[PDB]
Each structure stands twice: as C-alpha cells, then as structure tokens.
From a paper:
CaPLA1 was selectively expressed in young roots of the hot pepper and hydrolyzed phospholipids at the sn-1 position. In the case of CaPLA1, there are four molecules in the asymmetric unit. Among the four molecules, two molecules make a homodimer; the other two molecules make homodimers with another symmetry mate, respectively. Each monomer of CaPLA1 has an overall structure similar to that of AtDSEL; α/β hydrolase domain and C-terminal domain are almost the same as each other. CaPLA1 also has two disconnected loops resulting from the disordered residues; Pro91 and Asp92 between β1 and β2 and from Asp160 to Phe167 between α6 and α7 could not be refined because of the deficient electron density map of the residues. The disordered residues from Asp160 to Phe167 affected the surrounding secondary structures; a pair of β-strands (β4 and β5 in the case of AtDSEL) were not found in CaPLA1. The AUC result of CaPLA1 also suggests that CaPLA1 makes homodimers in solution, considering that the molecular weight of the theoretical dimeric CaPLA1 and calculated from the AUC peak are 90.4 kDa and 86.0 kDa, respectively. The dimerization domain of CaPLA1 is similar to that of AtDSEL; however, more residues are involved in the dimerization. In CaPLA1, His376, Met379, and Trp387 of one monomer and Trp371 and Trp372 of the other monomer make hydrophobic interactions. Therefore, the dimeric interface of CaPLA1 is more robust than that of AtDSEL.
The phospholipases are classified into four groups according to the cleavage site; phospholipase A1 (PLA1) cleaves sn-1 acyl chain, phospholipase A2 (PLA2) cleaves sn-2 acyl chain, phospholipase C (PLC) cleaves before the phosphate, and phospholipase D (PLD) cleaves after the phosphate. Here, we report the first molecular structures of plant PLA1s: AtDSEL and CaPLA1 derived from Arabidopsis thaliana and Capsicum annuum, respectively. AtDSEL and CaPLA1 are divided into the following two domains: the α/β hydrolase domain containing the lid domain, GXSXG motif, and catalytic triad and the C-terminal domain containing the dimerization domain. In addition to the conserved α/β hydrolase scaffold, GXSXG motif, and catalytic triad, plant PLA1s have an extended C-terminal domain composed of approximately 70 residues.
Residue numbers in the entry:
A (entry chain A): 4 to 159, 168 to 397
B (entry chain B): 4 to 90, 93 to 159, 168 to 397
Write the structure that this text describes.
Amino acid sequence: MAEKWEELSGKNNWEGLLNPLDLDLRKYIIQYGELAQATYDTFISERASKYAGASRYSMENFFTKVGLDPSKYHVTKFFYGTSSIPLPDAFMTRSLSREAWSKESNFMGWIAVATDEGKVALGRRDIVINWRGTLQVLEWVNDLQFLLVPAPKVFGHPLVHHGFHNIYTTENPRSQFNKTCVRDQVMEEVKRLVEEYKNEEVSITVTGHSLGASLATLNAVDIAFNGINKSSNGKEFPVTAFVFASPKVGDLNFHKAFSKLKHLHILRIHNLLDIVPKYPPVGYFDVGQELMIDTTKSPYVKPPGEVVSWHLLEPYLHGIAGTQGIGMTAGFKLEVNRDISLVNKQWMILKDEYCIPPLWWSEKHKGMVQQQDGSWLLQDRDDYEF
Amino acid sequence: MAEKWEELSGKNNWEGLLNPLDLDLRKYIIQYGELAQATYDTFISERASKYAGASRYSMENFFTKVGLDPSKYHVTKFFYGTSSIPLAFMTRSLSREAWSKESNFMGWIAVATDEGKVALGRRDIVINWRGTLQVLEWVNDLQFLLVPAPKVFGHPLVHHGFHNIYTTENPRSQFNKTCVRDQVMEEVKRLVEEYKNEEVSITVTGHSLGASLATLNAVDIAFNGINKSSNGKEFPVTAFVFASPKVGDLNFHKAFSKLKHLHILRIHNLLDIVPKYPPVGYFDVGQELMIDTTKSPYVKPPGEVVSWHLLEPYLHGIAGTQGIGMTAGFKLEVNRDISLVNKQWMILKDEYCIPPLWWSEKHKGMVQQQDGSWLLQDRDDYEF
C-alpha cells in the first residue's frame, strides 16, 4: 500500500482499479475523504459564534479533535478566503457578534504534511491540501450563476466558473486575513514544504468535497500548470486530487489544459442521485477520472432520502466503503470496517434501528460553558493565534 | 428571605406579594423553577439512547451537572412511573437492550443541605415532577375523562390520563412494581421522620404535565397526612407549578379548599394555551401569578405555542415581569442569564448570539473508542 502509493495516487489514472473497485484503493480514497471531512468537523457554522466561519480547533489539537490519527500528518497552515461579487449567502458564514473575528474572510481549509512515522505508512512525504465546501445544497446549486471568465492568476484560453474563481483569487488590502488571495496562501505554503522536503520523495495531494471539490480541482490544475510542484533543485513532484461530489469547474479549454499536465491526475467520486455533479448545466466539462457509487443501495441508510443526504461526504465515504457497482444487481456490502455512525455527524441518514442520534457532531452544550457567576458564555474555539 | 420563608411559601396565600411582584418572592419562584427545570435537563429524550426515558445524571452528580448549586440541596431519590392506557408522554427506547420497556424517570426528591437550611430558613424537602417539552402533540388530542382517585381520596373527580400515570402499578416491571405515587410518598415519609425534630417544609414543583402531577401530588400529601410526623407535627406543603393544565373538577377544588396546610402558586403565561386544558369541566386550584413573556425585548417575536410554554421562558418572564398591563413593559429585576431560554428551543433574538437548543452533551453522547469507532454512552454509571 505504501509500496503501491504511486499507482494508488493515479500513476496510471486508476485503470483497472475501479471496476471492480480495488480494496487498497477503497481504503486510499476513504482516508483522503477523512482529511476532507475534517474541514467540515472543525468549521464553525453557528452564526452566533464570534468565531463563525473560522476553525474551532487549533493546528496542534487538530487531528485528535476531529477524531483521526494524530501520528500520521501534522497540520502546518490554515488558509482563508474572501469574495467580491454577489454570492449565495451560504458560501461565506458571517458572525452576528460585534466582537467578530473577521467580517470578510472564512476558513477555507488546511494544509498538512506527513510525519516521519506517517511517511513510512504512506510511502513518501505526502503534502495534503484540503479545501472546505459547504453542507448546503438547496441554497446554492439551483441559484448560483455560472458565467465563464478567464483566470489570469492561473493560466496567464481556459475559461472558468466565475463564482469559484472569485473566491479563489480575491484580495483585500483592508482585510485582516486576506491581503493575499486564498490561492497564494496555499501556494506559498506548498512552495515552502516542497522546498523543505526537496531531498526526499514528495507527493502533493488535494482533497475537496462539493464547492471544495471545485476549488480543489482548480487548485490542483493551478499547482501543476505553474510548476509549484517543482522544487528549486529540479524535481517534479506528482500532483493528485481526490474530489467528492464535484461540480464542474471550467470549459473545453480548461479540460484541454488539464489534459496536457502529465504530472496531474484527478479522481472524482460521483453518487448516482446527487444533483450537485450536474452543475453547471451547460458549457462546462469534467476533468479527470470518475468513480460512480450509489448510496441508495445501502441497507443502513433511511429510504428514500433527499438531495442533502445523497450529497454529504460521510455518506459518500460510507458508500465507497460498501460499493459493489451501480448496476441493477450490484448490491452493497462493507469491505472495510468503517463505522456507520459517522454518517449521522451532520444529518439524519441512518435507520432508527441503528440507534445513532442525528447531527451528532457537536461540541458540549454547543460551545456554552458556565462561569463562576453561574451564567453561561459561548466559548467555542481553542486558544490559538490566526 | 430566610426569615420570611413562610410568607414566601404561601402562609398568607401570597396576598400583597404578587402585584406588584415582591422582589424576594420573584427570586423565590425562580429558585424553585430551576429545580423543576433540572427534570428536563437530566432527561434523555433521544430514543436512540439505550437509556431513553431515564436520567442521564446520577443523584451524586445531579446539581453540579444540571448547572445549579450543589451545596444547597442533595438528591435522595429518583422516582419512576408507568401507564396502562393509551396516551409522546412516555419516551420509548429504540435499543434492543433498553433499560426499561415500561417506565420513565418522572422526577427527583432532594432535601435541604445543612448549609442549605441556613439559606432556606428551614429543612425543606423538595419533590420535582417532570413535564414535557411538547405541546401540540397532546394539548389538542388528549382525552380528559373525569375519574375518581381512590388511592388519593378513598367525591373529587380527576383527570383520567394524569391519574393513570400517577397510580398505575405493574408486577413484572423492574421499576414500577409500586406506582409513582407510592414511590414519592415513601421517600417523603422517611424524610419527615428523619428530620421530625427540625423545622420542615415540603415543596412540590412542576411544569406542564409535571405541574398537574405536582398539583395532584401536593393535594395527596396534605389530604392523607403524609406531612405529619410521628412526633405530632404538621409540616406545611407548598406547590410552585408552572404552565399548569387543570387537574380536577369542583369537588377536587372543594377538597383543596379544606386543606389549610397546603398552598399552591401557579405561574401562568398569557399566550400559553396549555393552562386552558382541559377545555370544560375542570377547575384551577391555588393562587395564580400572570406573566406575559412576549413583553420581553429579548425573545424573537412573536413566538409560537412552544415558545410561550417552555419553563426557561417562564423563568425569564418572572425575572423581568412588571405586570401584563398594556403599558407595563419588561425589565429584568434579577440578573438571570438570558441564554437559558435557548436551552431547549430557539427563542432569543439573533443579536444576542446564543445558539439554539444548546443544552446538549458532547457529540450528543457519542464517545470514540480506542479503535476509532464511536459508541453512544450518554449516561452516568449508577445503579437504578
């Protein structure tokens, strides 16, 4: 698995590994989905929080508090993004507090690098870039406009989604955390990590779900097109992206530019009934390889479901954990021992018989802690500096 | 406040203390409301829990973990009840290892700490009945047959469903071989016997259905002399009930008027539809204080029948009530934290930055195991 890491990261574009789904690739896709789901588990969406839109966990406590292995990667940077055009009021979370940490920016994700122990298990010094999407579907997928605009910061022919590009490249000199656009905050950290581990074997892996999957895809093409995976000593490091429930990013020239990048491979996970991969409806093209799943075939989920349940990431990972194909007689059986309770972290999806509470990923008292006064204050974020 | 405890407990039926609302009685009503609210804060309503319908906190951890002062009272018994007629009222677990298929935690009894006695002015025994957070699932469909209560009186007619929960016993059940009535009465007697040489008071609290059960339970105590000690004393019985539906008919009220060691203060919110139940043939008992939570500039207007009914809005209403008159207004006379009204619902305005329904355990009881999986372990380790 560590010895086969190049093939698992798409060296041969996952040919022969998807139908039937290879067992080690099944684990591979899930573990990078866990790093993408970690962006959701740390993101404060409660507008009452004076840290709404920010990560509630510091970089040091990160993997432990999101329920993952803290021995494998080490978080090095949180990156933040802002916008400047009319967007659906669910892309950027805005605090109701007068002591708000920020009025322009949101936590867009985090970058981590494999530890020494993790490098043994992974097979190389892996640099992971995880982009945050949103939990909401109905609030944007049917109303967000999809104008095609150029991306000079990326390509200097290719046209790209106007909304995704604006979030990706908007700067603000009067802002506290987005004087540089989120793109550059990512690239500077990727460059210093590539420089830091230039004497080792290094891979770059981008993860994302929903809107984060579109930003991750554009980010992956961006890294490979501009040689940000090339070190100062002449090494080319491979760029790989595992994206989930991805809406389309660019047009035909964007696909054409993606095809020329020979050190880049994308694997998109697509749930049958999920309507988000349909977006945008005209003029856009997918890029990379695609694995199809159908969470409807799972006997654990509550039939019949809804568009939110077919879109969220933990159902996707549960679907990958048990997928046997999407054919009419494929069935469903868990090939990995992935806890089914994870599916209820942000929604009600499991059947009642499994006795898992709905929307259970929640801090104690939703961040309220009692004072010596006996009153209660919302203290929902770790003590760290931005 | 400790020297005036008899007046605050209704020695003179709170005459001269309700309008304008005396400040010591205002704090007094809120204090007993907090004890009633602890019945909701410890109750596991999540049907996914193996312990649905039971208390999530042990009696040892109770006051600290419900956010109250743990040096004033000390919990001495959890009591349980079951039913035998069709009635939401009883929470049923979906687990195949459910702690109980018949019973629910109906409330708790505590006794004044030594230091609590100095603060309260006497050794007060408190019995707190649990109600419900739901309204429209029963207030417009629950039948209200008038039935006798032989265990209570031996003429008064009382609500069929309330009496059935109050008196149903079940051999085969783990926790209700005795009805919930006898579980309360036995603990009350031994506490009266244990403190028969001191000043003792009995205070019953309750909200919603808990208020009706608390009303029936307080009348039951005074009528059968359960407040009487073996050394001849007759300790006063006081009931502070919130958002109470009615309990009995005119003979129930007539039997209440003859009990001169009993006093009941009902807190009634203007727009709350629950105090109208049942619609015909029933009568209120005790003294009444009217409030109007919709006069508060803190709550998101105009609210709904759930917002007008829950206990924490009631206590916030009492903390800031100036009367229900058109030009009365609203202003907090005590420093009660407004965030408490968002414990079980969304009520505050957005500007106050308090999350909705925030009373919740970490991960709603989920606990990660050493292998990375999660189990629902949402109850203290204690013996039922």
